[PDB]
Write a protein that binds this ligand. Structure first.
Ligand SMILES: *[C@@H]1O[C@H](CO)[C@@H](O)[C@H](O)[C@H]1NC(C)=O
Ligand SMILES: O=C(O)[C@@H]1CCN(c2ccccc2)C1
Length: 358
């Protein structure tokens, strides 16, 4: 249902220099726009992006992008699959910058790759205005995993872009899915080699210099020069944002456990690992105590909002599509039977019976 449009500005490129783009399915009756940021980890050094270019080149190049994409989950136009925003204008921005959407550089005779993730977002927004976005009432910038962190990094930058362009009426909002990470200690130590096993703290420290990534303004002014890597972590950057942001985060995100060098696959879970996993879930719940619009089930899973069965998980008897709807009403204090702060308290993966089974 979603049609590919490569960016008309040819200089806003993927990692290999091929043009970036976006998939679009218009809904001319609706004033609502969903711009989804794809995820897909990252690469924080040259001789490791090359490995990514060999087996994950679709995340670094638009050469072989399909002309058409199917909208799933919150990007679906069917009420059965998306009871929340099925009538909205759908935009899927493919992740081809490998920079957690923070780059604003350009490939040259001194850089192998281009990291323009932040420039991709603003250019898509720029080119969407002439295709109906100028009439929008709500622009919800959503994303999963790396895209979810990209939302936190870019939602204020999009709001200010629409304001400088002369669109004060467009309410820019954020939906950050599975991009709320902790810079915690690993369960077992590894050296930072390879993307999936490197500790979260050291991954971003290496990455942000390598991509020359940018961070939201007020967050940069708190941590200042050399410490902007702090702003890639939700519990640090979220208090500095001005746009309304809904946070969706599994309490036991598989990617968070991966960068922590945790592998729940074999029966014996010793008391040391049990303590680590329980403390991890406790710490994540604590970072969300002051996030008024949040959805955090106690599940071991990865991503939600573009999975076809995202309507099934419940926290305290409320599904995410309903929680997202109550969030809409809050922005039209607590509502009558329409909760927006939904954080599980039980301390072990799958203690919520509605957790995804597979
Ligand atoms: C295209 O995007 C690049 C990257 O930011 C920018 O420098 C350039 O001014 C843009 N060109 C046009 C015509 O918008
Ligand atoms: O699943 C993914 O896309 C990646 C897993 C680790 N990520 C991350 C870590 C720390 C800060 C921000 C992002 C994003």
């Amino acid at each position: 249902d979603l049609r590919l449009h490569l960016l008309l500005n040819t200089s806003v490129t993927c990692n290999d220099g091929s043009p970036a783009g976006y998939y679009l399915k218009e809904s001319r009756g609706s004033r609502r726009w969903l711009l989804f940021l794809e995820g897909g980890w990252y690469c924080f050094n040259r001789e490791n992006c090359d490995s990514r270019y060999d087996t994950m080149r679709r995340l670094m190049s638009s050469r072989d992008w399909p002309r058409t994409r199917t909208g799933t989950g919150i990007l679906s136009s069917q009420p059965e699959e998306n009871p929340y925003w099925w009538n909205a204008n759908m935009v899927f921005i493919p992740y081809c910058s490998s920079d957690v959407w923070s780059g604003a550089s350009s490939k040259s005779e001194k850089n192998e790759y281009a990291f323009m993730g932040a420039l991709i977002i603003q250019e898509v927004v720029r080119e969407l205005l002439g295709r109906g976005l100028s009439g929008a009432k709500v622009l919800l910038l959503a994303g999963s995993s790396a895209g979810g962190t990209g939302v936190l990094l870019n939602v204020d930058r999009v709001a200010e872009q629409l304001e400088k362009l002369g669109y004060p009426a467009i309410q820019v909002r954020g939906l950050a899915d599975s991009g709320w990470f902790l810079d915690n200690k690993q369960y077992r130590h590894t050296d930072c080699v390879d993307t999936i096993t490197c500790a979260p703290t050291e991954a971003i420290r290496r990455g942000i210099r390598y991509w020359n990534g940018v961070v939201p303004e007020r967050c940069r002014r708190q941590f200042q020069e050399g410490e902007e890597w702090n702003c890639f972590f939700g519990y640090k950057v979220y208090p500095t944002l001005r746009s309304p942001v809904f946070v969706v985060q599994w309490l036991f995100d598989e990617a968070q456990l991966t960068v922590d060098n945790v592998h729940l696959t074999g029966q014996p879970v010793q008391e040391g690992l049990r303590l680590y996993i329980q403390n991890l879930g406790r710490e994540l719940r604590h970072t969300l105590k002051d996030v008024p619009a949040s959805f955090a089930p106690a599940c071991l899973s990865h991503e939600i909002i573009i999975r076809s069965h995202w309507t099934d998980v419940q926290v305290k008897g409320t599904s995410l599509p309903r929680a997202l709807h109550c969030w809409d009403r809050s922005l039209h204090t607590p509502l009558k039977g329409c909760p927006v702060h939904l954080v599980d308290s039980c301390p072990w993966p799958h203690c919520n019976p509605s957790c995804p089974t597979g």
